[PDB]
Design a protein around this ligand. Structure first.
Ligand SMILES: [Zn+2]
Ligand SMILES: [Zn+2]
Lengths: 276, 747, 286
RNA sequence: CCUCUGCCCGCCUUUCCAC
RNA sequence: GUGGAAAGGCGGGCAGAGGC
């Protein structure tokens, strides 16, 4: 479907405070062979999609011209009226929770949200344009697990009656703070008009996650994840056709998500703008 | 009265009189007493045919059946024309029933004038049985030591047998249960080590007799040794494939009453096929050697008319099993033409097991070729508008899906609205009437017939009436056919009239709330049935294994006979009305669900009773499962079937309960876990000291990764628990069973 | 013969092991992307006339696994006549529930010679909990997803026999698009992704009339010994009909398979791959 | 170093298939 | 012309109460 190229973003997710992404004495999820923790791709994609739908919901007025089909929603959840595709923004009842998923391919081509994360509706659906891989540990932290150090902790938290001061403690496992991860996000350039927007929106939602939390408790301190990029390479359609290493590389080993979202958006991606 | 109903009933009353000699109440030899016992029964409340049937126990011993003279005088003296019987055909029927007795058990089984002896067990010939009834209630006839049966205990046997035979109708389907209930635990011939029951020797004599009659062999064809050595018999054998993927592949939308109705509907598919082989071949249910969890064997005749009818039955059953279930379940039927001399040992080689492994290979080569009689199996004809059932997964053409009785916003296939309604009637259901497919009340359909539910307050309809779990034709019309069949059926009820839910069971487990799932089967069973060298000895060894899993498992869930079980790992004392649902109980294996608490004790209350039900010479193997209530079945059962297979290919005698080298193994052995539980559990069953227990499991899980020894030593010391676990400071590997269970028994 | 063993070194879970109709469905969606509709039809015509790809099978560190032929299922008793009757029951059932075989043992099973089975399966199937959260109140609607999680150095590979101008022209480009786009469902959580390597595999075989297959054929005539597969996948958001495929290891006799085409109401048409992958095999008397 | 506490409560699949 | 498409395991919860 008009495939042009794939933009790959590789960076290190870093846990400044102890990450906890559970399973159901409260385990963080683990590889069933190595036993080392990991961050899923369902759990990182959907935390970016979540924080960004709350972002668009506040801006259903300013964005009606840059994004068409955003004038059909009024900001809110369609939870009060148990009908899907009413006039609100959060309009698909998945099971009990209401999520913005656009109803139709020709509207989801014009939403800022459903164009990047995709949508499902009768009479076809829009496949996502990103692939959020699972974020395993880096090899420096395998080789601290090989070295015999800890890699998860067991934290004990208590709830307290405020009048009697009676304590009833519970324990959460969480990954040790400091653990470096390794992510990869593979955008799919299906249109060449909106590829800058979908990358600026993917970096907007990554900047929300650096002041929100990823996974677990977070309001009590479990998030505080930090994104550290390495390199963004755009793979052209001809590169696959031949397998010759002939692809643009935007190199930024030490940059934030706010130092790359607008500081270098046109200064680093200028060579990606050229080749389309 | 015809001749086919005479040869069937002559062999079924041929070694009658063997019990009344042990009671001792006429002149002491059974070739006169059973003659007297029958014509006495012909006199008072007597049909006039019971006098004629005492020409069979009279001419038994071949000195009385000698030189063709003494019979023809006496058989002239009766009125055989008053039944239609010719002077010759009645004589021709005495020789068949005489030939059938020798093949069945053979002439080598024939003993001399011995005294009274106990029937030695077929699983262990050193031990022996007492005498009892076939109640399935409040008696586990374990093989005890040898004790001679007292001669007045037979007079209680005969006197009940007098009254039951007087009431019961003179027909094969009405005398098979009467002789089954009384003559099961009576030995056929008295000798040293005899393991053949008398009922099995009569059930199988009337089978080989009628398969000689339908074969067309004549008396001079027996008199000359000619019905033997010729391939005149036909071991029909049938089998199912994909029983597991049929019963358990349901989604999370199917409740337990549905699963319990999938198991009870694979039965009726199995009894529809067998009862079409018996009816279109003229045979009786004495021919069905076993019918046990899909795998049934039938003895028939070898005529070019019988083989012509079997190939329509195998055609119409497989085409039925393909329109209904898109290749999830297949029926492989084969048959081996056996001779007469292959019904028993000859020379030193077992010819019967050799002729039954020639039939196991026809079946083996057929379950490979899975639907090779459809002729459109690989024709990709493109049917349109295929919706798809949620509960089972079936493509269904052009919509036509009934709204579900549970939630009418979901559309199921039609054959799951039957198995909800059937699965709702399982409290009340006293059997099934089996009749024509287009008739009033038919819920389910088999390949051949349509099955009405015979409920409790309601008249039975049908030509043949299958009755679950009793040998008593109670309220059946006097013209119908009685098929008794046994089913292991313990369900915990709800306070409604119904079967308890995956929730409602597991909400009565003490501790954490889990759904316990056990699945296990008898270790090395097929090599047990290959030393059985006669068809009376295989029919013995196949009922007793079937009766354990049908009827001596519901006795265990009652908790009866903890003398023979003893002291088992019990989290709580075994309650009065347990919360255990028996989904499927096969002849050599079972799948039971229930609370995690009581499905644990039951898995040691089963191994311990099976070990005594045999003489010890056959062992079990169990998988056990702990699951959330709202787990789907296909995930649950595929786990535990693997987790049963895990506890099998190690050493095949191993309970599963709850290091990458290859010198360890996950599954506890039986006595191993029951000796770990005798020690480690009665000391720790430490008030809310669970940190002593939960860290000790994490101390254990460094050992898998001798740093653990002093770490346990400070921990057992910084409280003061020195008596607890002295050898724990490999025994750290084999304490994971006892800790992880008793932790779940306290929240 | 000498095949081309395309390794797929995974970068996550997969959804299931790819069968040979979902490998050709993926290549047909890659070659429609990087070339177009007028090159998908020249792709099918090189499989119709020529080349064959197989299903995918696991590897684990230079041991390559291949499906057990159903040819050894009857003869197993006559295979194992150097054993006693205590382990001729327990070798006989593990050699029948076995699903895969080494490259060394598979070459023995075609000869009807004794073999051993793999001690350890190179992957696990696990169910991972996934929760949908309402944006406004974080309400949780948990569901369970089952995916294949591989070991350290294991992965999956398929085979290819055919001309080399098809391989570099249509397969080695498509298996680099598929490395970054993934194979199977949930490819937006990083599922069916992989790196890719290419090797030279040689499999010895006997010469006979009958031949195992290493792909889900849609046979014109009935084969010798089979095992049904009843699958039908998905295609641009339309549900395919189900089709009786035959599982790998089924013995056919001189059967070329066949591609079935379907219509499904798309602007183009849909070719379901059903071609066989023959390896010669020595059978017993039936 | 002694004394009570040592996980609760939930959702547990929803929706799409052009005659 | 992929058993597919969309779908954050989370929402809340002082390891504390007395003990020189
Ligand atoms: Zn949208
Ligand atoms: Zn159904």
């Amino acid at each position: 479907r008009r495939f042009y190229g794939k933009i790959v973003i590789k960076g290190k997710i870093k846990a400044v405070t102890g990450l906890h992404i559970g399973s159901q004495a409260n385990p963080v999820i683990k590889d069933p062979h190595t036993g080392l923790p990991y961050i899923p791709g369902s759990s990182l994609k959907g935390r970016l999609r979540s924080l960004f739908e709350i972002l668009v919901n506040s801006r259903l007025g300013e964005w009606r011209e840059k994004y068409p089909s955003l004038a059909n929603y009024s900001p809110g959840s369609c939870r009060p009226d148990n009908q899907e595709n009413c006039g609100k923004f959060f309009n698909r009842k998945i099971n009990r929770g209401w999520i913005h998923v656009c109803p139709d391919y020709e509207t989801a081509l014009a939403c800022p949200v459903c164009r990047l994360f995709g949508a499902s509706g009768k009479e076809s659906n829009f496949p996502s344009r990103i692939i959020v891989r699972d974020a395993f540990l880096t090899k420096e932290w395998e080789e601290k697990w090989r070295a015999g150090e800890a890699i998860t902790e067991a934290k004990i938290e208590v709830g307290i009656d405020r009048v009697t001061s009676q304590a009833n403690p519970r324990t959460n496992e969480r990954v040790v703070a400091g653990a470096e991860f390794e992510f990869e996000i593979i955008y799919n350039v299906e249109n060449t008009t909106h590829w800058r927007d979908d990358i600026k929106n993917l970096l907007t939602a990554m900047a929300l996650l650096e002041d929100s939390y990823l996974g677990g408790s977070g309001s009590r301190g479990y998030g505080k994840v930090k994104f550290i990029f390495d390199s963004f390479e755009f793979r052209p359609l001809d590169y696959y056709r031949t397998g010759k290493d002939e692809d643009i590389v935007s190199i930024d080993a030490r940059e934030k998500s706010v130092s790359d979202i607008l500081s270098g958006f046109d200064s680093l991606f200028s060579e990606v703008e050229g080749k389309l | 009265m015809e001749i086919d109903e005479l040869t069937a009933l002559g062999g079924l009353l041929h070694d009658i009189g063997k019990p009344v000699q042990r009671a001792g109440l006429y002149s002491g030899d059974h070739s006169t007493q059973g003659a007297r016992f029958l014509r006495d029964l012909a006199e008072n409340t007597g049909r006039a045919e019971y006098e004629l049937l005492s020409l069979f126990s009279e001419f038994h011993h071949k000195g009385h059946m000698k030189n063709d003279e003494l019979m023809i005088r006496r058989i002239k003296e009766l009125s055989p024309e008053r039944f239609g019987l010719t002077m010759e055909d009645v004589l021709n029927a005495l020789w068949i029933v005489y030939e059938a007795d020798n093949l069945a058990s053979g002439e080598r089984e024939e003993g001399q004038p011995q005294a009274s002896r106990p029937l030695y067990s077929v699983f262990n010939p050193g031990k022996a049985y007492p005498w009892a009834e076939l109640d399935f209630e409040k008696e586990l006839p374990v093989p005890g030591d040898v004790f001679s049966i007292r001669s007045q205990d037979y007079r209680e046997l005969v006197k009940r047998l007098w009254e039951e035979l007087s009431k019961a109708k003179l027909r094969s389907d009405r005398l098979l249960p009467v002789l089954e209930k009384y003559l099961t635990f009576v030995s056929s011939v008295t000798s040293e080590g005899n393991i053949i029951s008398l009922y099995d020797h009569m059930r199988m004599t009337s089978a080989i007799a009628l398969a000689m009659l339908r074969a067309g062999c004549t008396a001079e064809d027996v008199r000359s040794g000619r019905c033997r050595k010729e391939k005149r018999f036909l071991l029909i054998e049938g089998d199912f494939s994909g029983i597991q993927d049929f019963i358990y592949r349901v989604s999370g939308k199917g409740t337990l009453k549905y699963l319990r109705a999938r198991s009870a509907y694979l039965e009726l598919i199995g009894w529809d096929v067998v009862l079409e082989i018996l009816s279109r071949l003229g045979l009786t249910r004495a021919n069905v050697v076993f019918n046990a969890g899909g795998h049934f064997m039938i003895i028939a005749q070898n005529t070019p008319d019988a083989v012509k009818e079997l190939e329509e039955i195998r055609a119409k059953a497989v085409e039925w099993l393909y329109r209904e279930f898109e290749s999830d379940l297949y029926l492989a039927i084969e048959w081996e033409p056996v001779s007469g001399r292959e019904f028993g040992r000859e020379g030193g080689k077992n010819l019967f097991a050799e002729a039954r492994k020639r039939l196991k290979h026809k079946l083996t080569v057929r379950k490979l070729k899975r639907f090779g009689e459809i002729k459109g199996l690989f024709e990709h004809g493109h049917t349109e508008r295929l919706a798809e059932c949620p509960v089972c997964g079936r493509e269904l053409p052009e919509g036509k899906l009934e709204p579900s009785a549970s939630d009418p916003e979901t559309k199921v296939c039609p054959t799951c609205n039957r198995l909800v309604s059937l699965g709702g009637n399982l409290p009340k259901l006293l059997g099934f009437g089996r009749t024509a497919k287009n008739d009033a009340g038919v819920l389910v359909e088999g390949p051949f017939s349509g099955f009405v539910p015979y409920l409790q307050g309601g008249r039975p309809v049908g030509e043949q009436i299958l009755v679950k779990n009793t040998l008593n034709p109670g309220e059946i019309p006097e013209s119908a056919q009685f098929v008794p069949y046994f089913v292991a059926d313990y369900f915990k009820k709800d306070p409604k009239g119904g079967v308890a839910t995956f929730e409602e069971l597991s909400m009565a487990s003490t501790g954490t709330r889990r759904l316990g799932v056990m699945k296990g089967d008898v270790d090395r069973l097929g090599e047990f049935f290959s030393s059985m060298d006669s068809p009376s000895k295989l029919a013995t060894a196949s009922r007793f294994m079937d009766y354990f899993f049908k009827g001596y498992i519901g006795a265990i869930i009652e908790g009866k006979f903890g003398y023979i079980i003893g002291d088992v790992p019990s989290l709580r004392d075994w309650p009065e009305e347990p919360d255990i649902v028996v989904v499927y109980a096969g002849g050599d294996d079972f799948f039971i669900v229930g609370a995690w608490d009581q499905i644990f004790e039951l898995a040691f209350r089963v191994r311990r009773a099976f070990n005594a039900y045999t003489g010890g010479k056959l062992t079990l193997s169990v998988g056990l499962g702990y699951f959330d209530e709202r787990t789907p079945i296909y995930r649950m059962a595929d786990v535990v079937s693997e987790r049963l297979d895990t506890a099998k290919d190690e050493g095949r005698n191993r309970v599963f309960v709850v290091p990458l080298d290859g010198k360890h193994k996950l599954s506890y052995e039986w006595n191993h876990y029951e000796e770990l539980w005798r020690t480690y559990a009665p000391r720790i069953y430490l008030e809310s000291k669970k940190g002593l227990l939960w860290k000790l499991l994490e101390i254990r899980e460094l050992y898998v990764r001798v740093r653990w020894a002093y770490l346990t030593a400070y921990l057992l010391g910084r409280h003061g628990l020195s008596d607890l676990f002295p050898e724990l400071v490999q025994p750290v590997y084999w304490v994971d069973g006892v800790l992880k269970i008793v932790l779940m028994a306290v929240r | 013969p000498k095949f081309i063993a395309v390794k797929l070194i995974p970068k996550g879970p997969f959804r299931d092991i790819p069968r040979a109709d979902t490998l050709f469905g993926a290549i047909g969606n890659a070659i429609s992307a990087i070339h177009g509709q007028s090159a998908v039809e020249e792709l099918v015509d090189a499989f119709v006339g020529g080349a064959r790809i197989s299903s995918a099978f696991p590897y684990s560190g230079d041991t390559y696994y291949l499906p057990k032929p159903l040819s050894v299922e009857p003869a197993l008793e006559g295979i194992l006549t150097g054993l006693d009757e205590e382990e001729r029951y327990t070798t006989a059932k593990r050699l029948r529930k076995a699903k895969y075989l080494d490259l060394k043992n598979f070459e023995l099973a075609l000869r009807l010679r004794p073999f051993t089975i793999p001690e350890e399966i190179p992957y696990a199937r696990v169910d991972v909990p996934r929760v949908v959260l309402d944006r406004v109140t974080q309400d949780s609607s948990i569901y369970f997803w089952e995916e294949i999680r591989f070991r350290e150095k294991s992965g999956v590979y398929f085979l290819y026999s055919g001309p080399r101008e098809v391989f570099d022209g249509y397969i080695a480009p498509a298996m680099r698009f598929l490395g970054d786009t993934g194979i199977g469902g949930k490819s937006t959580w990083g599922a069916g992704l992989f790196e890719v390597e290419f090797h030279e595999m040689k499999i010895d075989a006997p010469g006979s009339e009958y031949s195992v297959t290493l792909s889900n054929a849609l046979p014109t005539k009935t084969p010798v010994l089979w095992r049904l597969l009843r699958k039908g996948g998905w295609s641009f958001g339309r549900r395919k009909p189900r089709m009786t495929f035959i599982a790998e290891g089924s013995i056919v006799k001189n059967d070329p398979g066949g591609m079935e085409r379907l219509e499904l109401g798309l602007s183009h048409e849909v070719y379901v791959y059903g071609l066989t992958f023959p390896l010669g095999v020595e059978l017993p008397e039936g």
